[PDB]
């Protein structure tokens, strides 16, 4: 189907505790494949997926040099944004940036992304046209004016339409046995009595990849959105994910409830009920 590549940058100041830390991780879909950490004894871009290990020294050296440059640029940037908000030297702050590309089943660019946050709130984002900016406040307008003057948008668009799509295509082919393989969820329904009046039906999904999934409870065929407790999708540690959906039902009405599971690893969506 469709695929994404994303890089996630986190730069965090820590006054009195040395210079700001810079961390970068790269993903294809829900698979991490590289990391860089400026706190490492010897910082380098390092492999985190087997199919990236075959890349040559020029690849690793280029990704490492850029990340080391980014460490300094993000330290300077944290200083700049502290000034923009008239903030004290004593506080710790965070710049976050996520950028990347989505491509379709034919590898054609669907859209590009470049968004930045400051202390967890939207700061500046490249617009979907890959040509204009959305600044959250007058501080980000200062960044916007710097970036217009350096023609950053052209350089980000060039990357997003160029290297991003071409390297995503290369990774998808080199890692095709995992990245282009959808593992369906293993499902079951558990029954946990609450009292003599009520019980919890919990619908389980295990071992699935990618993370995207929809689990819903119906009572007499009507979605129980308001009454369903959804747990956040969680990683198993082996590339796969887990999730469950729960609903509190009247004792003796269990067969009126059905769990519905949609996932791209499944030929057809699933309807499940409690099997006592």
């Amino acid at each position: 189907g469709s695929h994404s590549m994303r890089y996630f940058y986190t730069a965090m100041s820590r006054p009195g505790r040395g210079e700001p830390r810079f961390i970068a991780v790269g993903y294809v879909d829900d698979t991490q494949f590289v990391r860089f950490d400026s706190d490492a004894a010897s910082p380098r871009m390092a492999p985190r997926a087997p199919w990236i290990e075959q890349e040559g020294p020029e690849y690793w050296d280029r990704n490492t040099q850029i990340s080391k440059t980014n460490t300094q640029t993000y330290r300077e940037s944290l200083r700049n944004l502290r000034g923009y908000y008239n903030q004290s030297e004593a506080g710790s702050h965070i710049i976050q940036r996520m950028y990347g590309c989505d491509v379709g089943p034919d590898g054609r660019l669907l859209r590009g992304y470049d968004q930045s946050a400051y202390d967890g709130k939207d700061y500046i984002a490249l617009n979907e046209d890959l040509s204009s900016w959305t600044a959250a406040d007058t501080a980000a307008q200062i960044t916007q004016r710097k970036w217009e003057a350096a023609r950053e948008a052209e350089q980000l668009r060039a990357y997003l339409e160029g290297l991003c799509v071409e390297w995503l295509r290369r990774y998808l082919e080199n890692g095709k046995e995992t990245l282009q393989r959808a593992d369906p969820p293993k499902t079951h329904v558990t029954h946990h009595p609450i009292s003599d009046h009520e019980a919890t039906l919990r619908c389980w999904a295990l071992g699935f990849y990618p993370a995207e999934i929809t689990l819903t409870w119906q009572r007499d065929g009507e979605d129980q959105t308001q009454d369903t407790e959804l747990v956040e999708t969680r990683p198993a540690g082996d590339r796969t994910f887990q999730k469950w959906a729960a609903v509190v039902v009247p004792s003796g009405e269990e067969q009126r409830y059905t769990c519905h599971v949609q996932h791209e690893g499944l030929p057809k969506p699933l309807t499940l009920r409690w099997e006592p």
Binding site: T73, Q155, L156
Partner: peptide
């Protein structure tokens, strides 16, 4: 592969 290092904020 990462994007070339860009301008400071």
């Amino acid at each position: 592969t990462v994007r070339a290092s860009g301008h400071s904020y």
